[PDB]
């Protein structure tokens, strides 16, 4: 892999900090670390689910309130590496560092990793592959970068490989080696329960997508926050699991399973590219909150893999009942007025109103919002709406979908 | 003031999220933010339930059932409302900026919480710099800013400095290469901004005077350039009565000020704040929204509750306690420097912060002496090379930190320094 074609001139330029470096009877007058005996917070005790207790003693608190490495605290990084191995067993583990060895870093949410990755790759006028409708957060990130977003057709089983084949045919495999031909830099995808569709990719489709990424030499950006929210029996193999070449950048998030407000996520990918990301982070946020990482690592030490897997299962059990409750309310009132696909993962139900052309007109909420937001051209009319089942009660859903049905009936009465 | 002549095309392009949010107030009792769409994860799934944090010189902080659910959930990009209002009021009592009641487009004073003051600085640099732009700075400077500016392909023009910081006549001599009218002509390429650490500059420990700041501001109007006031050691000034800040004298709305809690409350919590004109602060909030989304909700609530219970009085008492320690540390480092380094080096007394900047009298390059000979001997310090744009050039200076070493750790270490200096002077 020639990683040089995926790193910008600005990203390449980045150098490591001269004081990082530096970091047993040493006298340190090097590092400008503030004195922790001056910090006002002294000890902490956080209660868990249930009777379980996390404790930050005198010294643990001093560590928590102080600076820490850019990539994350060592104990968190080692625990996460082991999880990635048991879940995905990537081919890249023992590869030489320059050949794309598997590396990890803790980010201030999964959004930070995605952002630094997009900024490392995109030069104004570069072609990027994506599937509409997409997560508004990535569209909002890509827009200022002045790149060309080429939409790939999708259905109930996510990205359609033949659409990607048809698109890619505008270039020749040999063109990737020629810089001035301008072949796609990457393909971005949410493989499980895409925001806003709730649709998931299959094993066969992923295999086919990977085969095209080798052929036309482009990276795969696996944004998988709903990986631990798959409804059906046995999780689908990830792009990272089949990454023989070291062309996959995977983003994981604790936001849907542990806490969204703590701002803790992780990026997995080849060492050359992960390095560039750590060097940018080193000049932005310096590192993710020491306190917030120690909170998760102490919880993880208490739970272990079993305790963590048992917790994911309790979260899946909650979202599965919510999904069933939104589907029942949808069946009761929307039948004859709308069409929808059963969500494979996540927290969203994507509704297509049968008659109407623009649904933004109809709403004029709570759990619903219009399709417009999930497109590059948000000014175009959309008959779709996104309903969230993460918080509404089964009876809150019934009441709301009953209001939807009447509004739909009103618009259909007028020519 | 045309703010647009300073920003990049990418910065302008940024839009707010289509998914609308806000703090409740109309419901239950405890206010927390809600999403008007909305895909907020269920907080009844989060494993952390309640929290109790002890405070030395304050009441014990407590996060109950509902407060914890708020803390573990998403929050606004600019910061939690209670922290933003408290910080705005502090900026008013400390700096009383002229820009407070100005129209928003005229550079009205605005604030935002960042994930450390480094994040604010970063987003600000990225907002302004286009490859080939001229920027004003004083060497030696904070390595973090140099490491930030280097990939941006901008031309760093060094301004001469002394014990009283930036020398206004050097800045006058530099600026003379253009005419005041040139700022209005895009193709003339006049400086976009001047970056400065006004109190206890990293690595010098030198501080700017009131008279010098006034003179610097007068030049920024004349040649129309912003002032980036990176002030983390503002609350670590060793002499009686703090010097007025650039923000305090900002009649035009040309000042972007960065503040940090790292040296006074906690560095590991990653909480800082940016103060400046609403048009430029918006651009910064909009970039943050696509990077980290917002600063940790938990970490903000912790500071907000401490600051609120303390009051400004409580806060000031704590900064006075902090300053007291570093001042004693500064005296110890100066004594150890007097004892061993006299005859071998020269230094200025630090006005603020945690660093002592030593110039070795004889030697030209302090690098192998500090990275090889000194580590072998068990003493850690930094060579001057790191604090320059051209880090490959030899440096006779070294930076010593007095933030943690004991008075006897200082004595032992400076005794090792003297022997190493004496060794190099023996060889021609
Ligand atoms: C596919 C995908 N990739 C990456 C990320 C980033 O995840 P991290 O790992 O960084 O946490 C997400 C998070 N998604 C949403 C966040 C969200 C946040 C909100 O609150 C704020 C607060 C401040 C600024 C903006 C939004 C209000 C509504 C929100 N929302 C929604 O309605 N659908 N999906 C979301 C994602 O879905
Ligand atoms: C003038 C000025 N302006 C803004 C900021 C940013 O302040 P905030 O973003 O925290 O508000 C600073 C921070 N200074 C230092 C940080 C520092 C951090 C370290 O720990 C890490 C950890 C991870 C990555 C990099 C460094 C190890 C040594 C460090 N160090 C040193 O030795 N001198 N000054 C520092 C500053 O001096």
Short mmCIF file of N, CA and C in Angstrom, two decimals, chain A residues 10 13-15 18-19 22 26-35 38-49 54 61 65-67 108 111-112 115-116 119 136 140-141 143-144 255-256 258-263 280 283-287 289-292 295 299 303 311 318-319 347-348 366-369 373 386 388 390-391, chain B residues 10 13-16 18-19 37-42 45-56 61 68 72-74 115 118-119 122-123 126 143 147-148 150-151 262-263 265-268 270 287 290-294 296-299 302 306 318 325-326 333 354-355 375 378-382 386 399-401 403 409 412-413:
data_model
loop_
_atom_site.label_atom_id
_atom_site.label_comp_id
_atom_site.label_asym_id
_atom_site.label_seq_id
_atom_site.Cartn_x
_atom_site.Cartn_y
_atom_site.Cartn_z
N UNK A 10 -0.16 18.94 3.95
CA UNK A 10 -0.29 19.46 5.31
C UNK A 10 -0.14 18.34 6.36
N UNK A 13 3.58 17.04 6.60
CA UNK A 13 4.37 18.09 7.26
C UNK A 13 4.46 17.97 8.77
N UNK A 14 3.38 17.49 9.43
CA UNK A 14 3.28 17.32 10.88
C UNK A 14 4.43 16.51 11.49
N UNK A 15 5.00 17.02 12.58
CA UNK A 15 6.11 16.39 13.31
C UNK A 15 5.71 16.12 14.79
N UNK A 18 8.23 18.05 20.78
CA UNK A 18 9.57 17.88 21.36
C UNK A 18 9.61 17.50 22.84
N UNK A 19 8.48 17.66 23.56
CA UNK A 19 8.33 17.36 24.99
C UNK A 19 7.56 16.02 25.20
N UNK A 22 10.79 12.81 26.24
CA UNK A 22 10.96 13.07 27.68
C UNK A 22 10.23 12.00 28.53
N UNK A 26 15.01 9.87 38.52
CA UNK A 26 15.21 11.00 37.62
C UNK A 26 14.72 12.29 38.26
N UNK A 27 15.43 13.38 38.04
CA UNK A 27 14.97 14.69 38.49
C UNK A 27 14.44 15.38 37.23
N UNK A 28 13.11 15.55 37.14
CA UNK A 28 12.47 16.17 35.98
C UNK A 28 12.14 17.67 36.14
N UNK A 29 12.89 18.51 35.40
CA UNK A 29 12.70 19.96 35.29
C UNK A 29 12.38 20.25 33.84
N UNK A 30 12.01 19.19 33.09
CA UNK A 30 11.70 19.25 31.67
C UNK A 30 10.29 19.72 31.44
N UNK A 31 9.35 18.79 31.63
CA UNK A 31 7.92 18.97 31.43
C UNK A 31 7.28 20.01 32.31
N UNK A 32 6.55 20.89 31.65
CA UNK A 32 5.75 21.95 32.24
C UNK A 32 4.38 21.50 32.70
N UNK A 33 4.32 20.35 33.40
CA UNK A 33 3.08 19.81 33.97
C UNK A 33 2.75 20.63 35.23
N UNK A 34 1.50 21.09 35.37
CA UNK A 34 1.14 21.86 36.57
C UNK A 34 1.17 20.99 37.83
N UNK A 35 1.38 21.60 39.01
CA UNK A 35 1.40 20.83 40.24
C UNK A 35 -0.03 20.30 40.58
N UNK A 38 -2.36 21.27 43.79
CA UNK A 38 -3.03 22.57 43.71
C UNK A 38 -4.47 22.46 43.21
N UNK A 39 -4.80 21.31 42.59
CA UNK A 39 -6.12 21.04 42.01
C UNK A 39 -7.18 20.90 43.09
N UNK A 40 -8.35 21.56 42.92
CA UNK A 40 -9.37 21.53 44.00
C UNK A 40 -10.12 20.23 44.24
N UNK A 41 -10.23 19.35 43.23
CA UNK A 41 -10.94 18.07 43.39
C UNK A 41 -9.98 17.05 44.04
N UNK A 42 -10.44 16.38 45.10
CA UNK A 42 -9.58 15.50 45.88
C UNK A 42 -9.78 13.99 45.78
N UNK A 43 -11.04 13.51 45.85
CA UNK A 43 -11.42 12.09 45.76
C UNK A 43 -12.78 11.98 45.09
N UNK A 44 -13.09 10.83 44.49
CA UNK A 44 -14.37 10.65 43.83
C UNK A 44 -14.90 9.24 44.00
N UNK A 45 -16.24 9.13 44.14
CA UNK A 45 -16.94 7.87 44.26
C UNK A 45 -18.20 7.94 43.41
N UNK A 46 -18.22 7.11 42.36
CA UNK A 46 -19.29 7.00 41.38
C UNK A 46 -19.96 5.63 41.55
N UNK A 47 -21.31 5.65 41.74
CA UNK A 47 -22.10 4.42 41.85
C UNK A 47 -22.48 3.92 40.45
N UNK A 48 -22.57 2.58 40.29
CA UNK A 48 -22.85 1.89 39.01
C UNK A 48 -24.17 1.05 39.11
N UNK A 49 -24.47 0.23 38.08
CA UNK A 49 -25.64 -0.66 37.99
C UNK A 49 -25.31 -2.13 38.43
N UNK A 54 -17.12 2.58 41.62
CA UNK A 54 -15.85 3.09 41.08
C UNK A 54 -15.32 4.12 42.10
N UNK A 61 -7.02 10.42 41.63
CA UNK A 61 -7.59 11.73 41.33
C UNK A 61 -6.53 12.66 40.74
N UNK A 65 -6.84 14.27 36.93
CA UNK A 65 -6.90 15.72 36.73
C UNK A 65 -5.69 16.29 35.98
N UNK A 66 -4.74 15.42 35.60
CA UNK A 66 -3.48 15.78 34.92
C UNK A 66 -3.45 15.36 33.43
N UNK A 67 -2.53 15.98 32.62
CA UNK A 67 -2.30 15.65 31.21
C UNK A 67 -1.97 14.14 31.05
N UNK A 108 -11.89 12.09 21.03
CA UNK A 108 -12.92 12.79 21.80
C UNK A 108 -14.27 12.64 21.10
N UNK A 111 -16.60 11.14 16.23
CA UNK A 111 -16.68 12.28 15.33
C UNK A 111 -15.31 12.94 15.11
N UNK A 112 -14.48 12.97 16.16
CA UNK A 112 -13.15 13.57 16.10
C UNK A 112 -12.24 12.77 15.18
N UNK A 115 -13.37 13.26 11.53
CA UNK A 115 -12.97 14.60 11.14
C UNK A 115 -11.50 14.68 10.73
N UNK A 116 -10.58 14.19 11.60
CA UNK A 116 -9.14 14.19 11.36
C UNK A 116 -8.77 13.34 10.15
N UNK A 119 -9.88 15.26 6.93
CA UNK A 119 -8.93 16.37 6.77
C UNK A 119 -7.54 15.91 6.26
N UNK A 136 -26.07 13.29 8.62
CA UNK A 136 -25.93 14.75 8.43
C UNK A 136 -24.57 15.30 8.93
N UNK A 140 -22.04 17.54 6.76
CA UNK A 140 -21.65 18.83 7.32
C UNK A 140 -20.14 18.98 7.44
N UNK A 141 -19.43 17.84 7.60
CA UNK A 141 -17.98 17.75 7.68
C UNK A 141 -17.35 17.86 6.30
N UNK A 143 -18.74 19.04 3.28
CA UNK A 143 -19.11 20.27 2.58
C UNK A 143 -18.01 21.37 2.52
N UNK A 144 -17.38 21.78 3.66
CA UNK A 144 -16.33 22.82 3.59
C UNK A 144 -15.03 22.39 2.92
N UNK A 255 -20.90 6.11 22.66
CA UNK A 255 -22.05 7.01 22.74
C UNK A 255 -23.42 6.34 22.85
N UNK A 256 -23.63 5.24 22.12
CA UNK A 256 -24.92 4.55 22.16
C UNK A 256 -24.99 3.46 23.25
N UNK A 258 -22.35 3.33 26.38
CA UNK A 258 -21.81 3.72 27.70
C UNK A 258 -22.14 5.17 28.11
N UNK A 259 -21.84 6.16 27.24
CA UNK A 259 -22.12 7.58 27.45
C UNK A 259 -21.73 8.40 26.24
N UNK A 260 -22.63 9.31 25.83
CA UNK A 260 -22.40 10.23 24.73
C UNK A 260 -21.71 11.54 25.21
N UNK A 261 -22.04 11.98 26.42
CA UNK A 261 -21.50 13.20 27.02
C UNK A 261 -20.08 13.11 27.54
N UNK A 262 -19.53 11.88 27.66
CA UNK A 262 -18.16 11.68 28.12
C UNK A 262 -17.14 11.94 26.99
N UNK A 263 -17.60 11.89 25.71
CA UNK A 263 -16.81 12.13 24.48
C UNK A 263 -15.60 11.18 24.37
N UNK A 280 -2.27 15.20 14.49
CA UNK A 280 -3.21 16.31 14.36
C UNK A 280 -3.87 16.55 15.74
N UNK A 283 -2.12 18.60 18.25
CA UNK A 283 -2.19 20.06 18.09
C UNK A 283 -3.62 20.63 18.26
N UNK A 284 -4.62 19.78 18.49
CA UNK A 284 -5.98 20.26 18.72
C UNK A 284 -6.32 20.16 20.21
N UNK A 285 -6.74 18.99 20.67
CA UNK A 285 -7.20 18.74 22.03
C UNK A 285 -6.12 18.21 22.97
N UNK A 286 -4.86 17.98 22.46
CA UNK A 286 -3.71 17.35 23.14
C UNK A 286 -3.99 15.86 23.45
N UNK A 287 -5.16 15.53 24.06
CA UNK A 287 -5.55 14.16 24.44
C UNK A 287 -7.03 14.10 24.86
N UNK A 289 -9.99 13.57 27.62
CA UNK A 289 -10.09 13.76 29.07
C UNK A 289 -9.54 12.57 29.87
N UNK A 290 -8.54 12.80 30.74
CA UNK A 290 -7.92 11.73 31.55
C UNK A 290 -8.95 11.13 32.49
N UNK A 291 -9.74 12.01 33.17
CA UNK A 291 -10.79 11.61 34.11
C UNK A 291 -11.78 10.65 33.43
N UNK A 292 -12.33 11.04 32.26
CA UNK A 292 -13.34 10.29 31.52
C UNK A 292 -12.89 8.90 31.05
N UNK A 295 -12.53 6.56 34.17
CA UNK A 295 -13.88 6.20 34.59
C UNK A 295 -14.31 4.92 33.86
N UNK A 299 -14.36 0.89 35.16
CA UNK A 299 -15.60 0.16 34.96
C UNK A 299 -15.26 -1.14 34.23
N UNK A 303 -15.99 -5.13 35.31
CA UNK A 303 -16.83 -5.94 34.45
C UNK A 303 -16.10 -7.10 33.74
N UNK A 311 -23.65 -6.42 29.36
CA UNK A 311 -24.19 -5.08 29.27
C UNK A 311 -24.67 -4.78 27.86
N UNK A 318 -33.21 -3.71 25.28
CA UNK A 318 -34.02 -2.51 25.37
C UNK A 318 -34.42 -1.97 23.98
N UNK A 319 -33.44 -1.82 23.04
CA UNK A 319 -33.72 -1.30 21.70
C UNK A 319 -34.57 -2.23 20.81
N UNK A 347 -31.46 2.82 16.06
CA UNK A 347 -32.60 3.48 16.71
C UNK A 347 -33.57 4.25 15.78
N UNK A 348 -33.46 4.08 14.46
CA UNK A 348 -34.35 4.81 13.54
C UNK A 348 -35.27 3.97 12.64
N UNK A 366 -41.21 15.73 17.81
CA UNK A 366 -40.86 14.95 19.03
C UNK A 366 -39.87 13.84 18.68
N UNK A 367 -40.37 12.81 17.95
CA UNK A 367 -39.62 11.64 17.50
C UNK A 367 -39.36 11.68 16.00
N UNK A 368 -40.10 12.52 15.26
CA UNK A 368 -39.97 12.62 13.80
C UNK A 368 -39.28 13.87 13.31
N UNK A 369 -38.66 13.79 12.11
CA UNK A 369 -37.98 14.87 11.38
C UNK A 369 -37.95 14.59 9.84
N UNK A 373 -32.66 16.80 5.43
CA UNK A 373 -31.38 16.88 6.17
C UNK A 373 -30.31 15.84 5.82
N UNK A 386 -37.78 10.58 9.29
CA UNK A 386 -37.06 9.71 10.22
C UNK A 386 -37.67 9.78 11.61
N UNK A 388 -37.51 8.24 15.53
CA UNK A 388 -36.59 7.63 16.49
C UNK A 388 -37.35 6.88 17.56
N UNK A 390 -35.63 5.49 20.26
CA UNK A 390 -34.70 5.37 21.38
C UNK A 390 -35.27 5.81 22.73
N UNK A 391 -36.31 6.65 22.74
CA UNK A 391 -36.84 7.18 24.00
C UNK A 391 -38.36 7.15 24.20
N UNK B 10 -13.07 27.74 3.31
CA UNK B 10 -13.56 26.55 4.01
C UNK B 10 -14.30 26.94 5.28
N UNK B 13 -17.85 28.49 4.48
CA UNK B 13 -18.71 27.40 4.00
C UNK B 13 -19.54 26.69 5.07
N UNK B 14 -18.97 26.52 6.28
CA UNK B 14 -19.57 25.83 7.43
C UNK B 14 -20.97 26.32 7.77
N UNK B 15 -21.88 25.38 7.99
CA UNK B 15 -23.28 25.66 8.34
C UNK B 15 -23.67 25.02 9.70
N UNK B 16 -24.70 25.53 10.40
CA UNK B 16 -25.11 24.85 11.65
C UNK B 16 -25.84 23.54 11.34
N UNK B 18 -28.54 20.62 10.86
CA UNK B 18 -29.98 20.69 10.54
C UNK B 18 -30.85 20.19 11.70
N UNK B 19 -30.26 19.36 12.59
CA UNK B 19 -30.91 18.80 13.78
C UNK B 19 -30.85 19.82 14.95
N UNK B 37 -35.38 16.69 16.98
CA UNK B 37 -35.57 15.65 15.98
C UNK B 37 -36.12 14.29 16.54
N UNK B 38 -35.39 13.45 17.30
CA UNK B 38 -34.00 13.55 17.74
C UNK B 38 -33.42 12.21 18.15
N UNK B 39 -32.14 11.98 17.81
CA UNK B 39 -31.51 10.69 18.04
C UNK B 39 -30.62 10.61 19.24
N UNK B 40 -31.06 11.17 20.39
CA UNK B 40 -30.28 11.11 21.62
C UNK B 40 -30.39 9.70 22.18
N UNK B 41 -29.24 9.07 22.56
CA UNK B 41 -29.31 7.70 23.10
C UNK B 41 -30.05 7.71 24.44
N UNK B 42 -30.67 6.58 24.80
CA UNK B 42 -31.38 6.52 26.06
C UNK B 42 -30.40 6.58 27.26
N UNK B 45 -29.73 3.67 30.02
CA UNK B 45 -28.88 2.55 29.59
C UNK B 45 -27.43 2.73 30.04
N UNK B 46 -27.05 3.97 30.38
CA UNK B 46 -25.70 4.34 30.79
C UNK B 46 -25.35 3.73 32.16
N UNK B 47 -24.16 3.11 32.30
CA UNK B 47 -23.83 2.42 33.57
C UNK B 47 -23.54 3.29 34.81
N UNK B 48 -23.13 4.55 34.63
CA UNK B 48 -22.85 5.43 35.77
C UNK B 48 -24.15 6.03 36.29
N UNK B 49 -24.38 5.95 37.62
CA UNK B 49 -25.66 6.36 38.20
C UNK B 49 -25.71 7.63 39.06
N UNK B 50 -24.73 7.82 39.97
CA UNK B 50 -24.62 8.99 40.87
C UNK B 50 -23.14 9.26 41.13
N UNK B 51 -22.79 10.49 41.51
CA UNK B 51 -21.40 10.83 41.79
C UNK B 51 -21.26 11.83 42.91
N UNK B 52 -20.19 11.68 43.69
CA UNK B 52 -19.84 12.57 44.78
C UNK B 52 -18.33 12.81 44.74
N UNK B 53 -17.97 14.07 44.48
CA UNK B 53 -16.61 14.55 44.37
C UNK B 53 -16.33 15.50 45.55
N UNK B 54 -15.24 15.22 46.29
CA UNK B 54 -14.82 16.04 47.43
C UNK B 54 -14.01 17.24 46.95
N UNK B 55 -14.20 18.38 47.62
CA UNK B 55 -13.48 19.62 47.32
C UNK B 55 -12.85 20.20 48.59
N UNK B 56 -11.51 20.46 48.50
CA UNK B 56 -10.70 21.13 49.51
C UNK B 56 -11.03 22.63 49.33
N UNK B 61 -19.30 18.41 45.89
CA UNK B 61 -20.07 18.40 44.63
C UNK B 61 -20.85 17.07 44.52
N UNK B 68 -26.70 13.23 36.77
CA UNK B 68 -25.83 12.23 36.14
C UNK B 68 -26.30 11.93 34.71
N UNK B 72 -23.90 12.62 31.42
CA UNK B 72 -23.51 11.53 30.52
C UNK B 72 -24.08 11.64 29.10
N UNK B 73 -24.86 12.71 28.84
CA UNK B 73 -25.55 12.97 27.57
C UNK B 73 -24.93 14.15 26.78
N UNK B 74 -25.22 14.21 25.45
CA UNK B 74 -24.77 15.30 24.60
C UNK B 74 -25.24 16.67 25.18
N UNK B 115 -12.13 22.26 24.24
CA UNK B 115 -11.53 21.10 24.91
C UNK B 115 -10.05 21.39 25.15
N UNK B 118 -5.88 24.91 23.75
CA UNK B 118 -5.19 24.46 22.53
C UNK B 118 -6.18 24.24 21.37
N UNK B 119 -7.39 23.78 21.68
CA UNK B 119 -8.40 23.51 20.67
C UNK B 119 -8.88 24.82 20.04
N UNK B 122 -6.08 26.26 17.80
CA UNK B 122 -6.03 25.42 16.61
C UNK B 122 -7.09 25.81 15.58
N UNK B 123 -8.36 25.87 16.01
CA UNK B 123 -9.50 26.21 15.16
C UNK B 123 -9.38 27.63 14.60
N UNK B 126 -6.58 27.66 11.87
CA UNK B 126 -7.14 26.97 10.69
C UNK B 126 -8.18 27.83 9.93
N UNK B 143 6.07 25.82 21.66
CA UNK B 143 6.24 24.77 20.64
C UNK B 143 4.93 24.26 20.04
N UNK B 147 4.25 24.09 16.12
CA UNK B 147 3.88 22.80 15.57
C UNK B 147 2.53 22.83 14.85
N UNK B 148 1.65 23.77 15.27
CA UNK B 148 0.34 24.02 14.69
C UNK B 148 0.48 24.81 13.39
N UNK B 150 3.33 25.38 11.38
CA UNK B 150 4.22 24.76 10.39
C UNK B 150 3.50 24.04 9.22
N UNK B 151 2.51 23.15 9.44
CA UNK B 151 1.84 22.50 8.30
C UNK B 151 0.93 23.41 7.46
N UNK B 262 -6.12 24.87 32.97
CA UNK B 262 -5.05 23.88 33.10
C UNK B 262 -4.03 24.14 34.20
N UNK B 263 -3.65 25.41 34.39
CA UNK B 263 -2.65 25.75 35.40
C UNK B 263 -3.27 26.05 36.77
N UNK B 265 -7.09 24.93 37.75
CA UNK B 265 -8.13 23.99 38.20
C UNK B 265 -7.83 22.52 37.86
N UNK B 266 -7.56 22.22 36.57
CA UNK B 266 -7.22 20.88 36.07
C UNK B 266 -6.83 20.91 34.60
N UNK B 267 -5.74 20.23 34.27
CA UNK B 267 -5.25 20.09 32.90
C UNK B 267 -5.88 18.87 32.19
N UNK B 268 -6.13 17.80 32.96
CA UNK B 268 -6.71 16.56 32.47
C UNK B 268 -8.19 16.59 32.16
N UNK B 270 -9.59 18.97 30.33
CA UNK B 270 -9.63 19.56 28.98
C UNK B 270 -10.75 20.59 28.84
N UNK B 287 -16.72 24.72 13.56
CA UNK B 287 -15.69 23.72 13.30
C UNK B 287 -15.75 22.67 14.41
N UNK B 290 -18.16 19.89 14.19
CA UNK B 290 -17.79 18.77 13.31
C UNK B 290 -16.57 17.97 13.79
N UNK B 291 -15.92 18.40 14.89
CA UNK B 291 -14.76 17.66 15.41
C UNK B 291 -15.18 16.86 16.65
N UNK B 292 -15.23 17.52 17.82
CA UNK B 292 -15.56 16.91 19.11
C UNK B 292 -17.02 17.01 19.48
N UNK B 293 -17.82 17.74 18.68
CA UNK B 293 -19.26 18.03 18.87
C UNK B 293 -19.48 19.08 19.95
N UNK B 294 -18.90 18.83 21.15
CA UNK B 294 -18.97 19.68 22.33
C UNK B 294 -17.91 19.27 23.38
N UNK B 296 -16.78 17.75 26.98
CA UNK B 296 -17.37 16.80 27.93
C UNK B 296 -18.43 17.47 28.86
N UNK B 297 -19.69 16.96 28.84
CA UNK B 297 -20.77 17.51 29.66
C UNK B 297 -20.44 17.32 31.14
N UNK B 298 -19.95 16.11 31.50
CA UNK B 298 -19.58 15.78 32.87
C UNK B 298 -18.55 16.79 33.42
N UNK B 299 -17.45 17.00 32.67
CA UNK B 299 -16.33 17.87 33.07
C UNK B 299 -16.70 19.34 33.30
N UNK B 302 -18.90 19.78 36.58
CA UNK B 302 -17.95 19.73 37.68
C UNK B 302 -17.36 21.14 37.96
N UNK B 306 -18.40 24.02 40.95
CA UNK B 306 -17.33 24.47 41.83
C UNK B 306 -17.28 26.01 41.79
N UNK B 318 -8.57 30.99 45.66
CA UNK B 318 -7.89 29.83 45.11
C UNK B 318 -6.70 30.25 44.23
N UNK B 325 2.34 29.26 46.05
CA UNK B 325 3.18 28.08 45.89
C UNK B 325 4.25 28.30 44.81
N UNK B 326 3.83 28.69 43.57
CA UNK B 326 4.74 28.91 42.44
C UNK B 326 5.77 30.02 42.69
N UNK B 333 14.21 27.98 42.74
CA UNK B 333 14.93 27.81 41.47
C UNK B 333 15.99 28.92 41.28
N UNK B 354 5.68 29.21 35.18
CA UNK B 354 6.45 28.10 35.77
C UNK B 354 7.83 27.80 35.13
N UNK B 355 8.35 28.69 34.28
CA UNK B 355 9.65 28.45 33.63
C UNK B 355 10.77 29.45 33.92
N UNK B 375 20.66 13.12 30.75
CA UNK B 375 19.76 12.00 31.02
C UNK B 375 20.56 10.85 31.67
N UNK B 378 20.91 11.45 35.12
CA UNK B 378 19.62 11.42 35.81
C UNK B 378 18.83 12.71 35.99
N UNK B 379 19.14 13.77 35.19
CA UNK B 379 18.46 15.08 35.25
C UNK B 379 17.79 15.41 33.90
N UNK B 380 16.51 15.78 33.96
CA UNK B 380 15.70 16.11 32.79
C UNK B 380 15.39 17.57 32.71
N UNK B 381 15.67 18.16 31.53
CA UNK B 381 15.46 19.56 31.15
C UNK B 381 15.23 19.60 29.63
N UNK B 382 14.84 20.77 29.07
CA UNK B 382 14.62 20.93 27.63
C UNK B 382 15.58 21.89 26.91
N UNK B 386 13.60 23.55 20.37
CA UNK B 386 12.16 23.33 20.26
C UNK B 386 11.30 24.59 20.15
N UNK B 399 15.36 25.45 28.91
CA UNK B 399 14.19 25.78 29.72
C UNK B 399 14.06 24.83 30.93
N UNK B 400 14.08 25.41 32.14
CA UNK B 400 13.95 24.70 33.40
C UNK B 400 12.58 24.99 34.02
N UNK B 401 11.85 23.94 34.43
CA UNK B 401 10.53 24.09 35.04
C UNK B 401 10.61 23.95 36.54
N UNK B 403 7.68 23.92 38.45
CA UNK B 403 6.32 23.59 38.89
C UNK B 403 6.22 22.41 39.86
N UNK B 409 15.74 19.05 45.11
CA UNK B 409 15.78 18.39 43.79
C UNK B 409 16.43 19.36 42.80
N UNK B 412 20.37 19.66 43.60
CA UNK B 412 21.01 18.46 43.04
C UNK B 412 21.14 18.57 41.51
N UNK B 413 20.05 18.95 40.82
CA UNK B 413 19.99 19.07 39.37
C UNK B 413 20.87 20.17 38.78
#
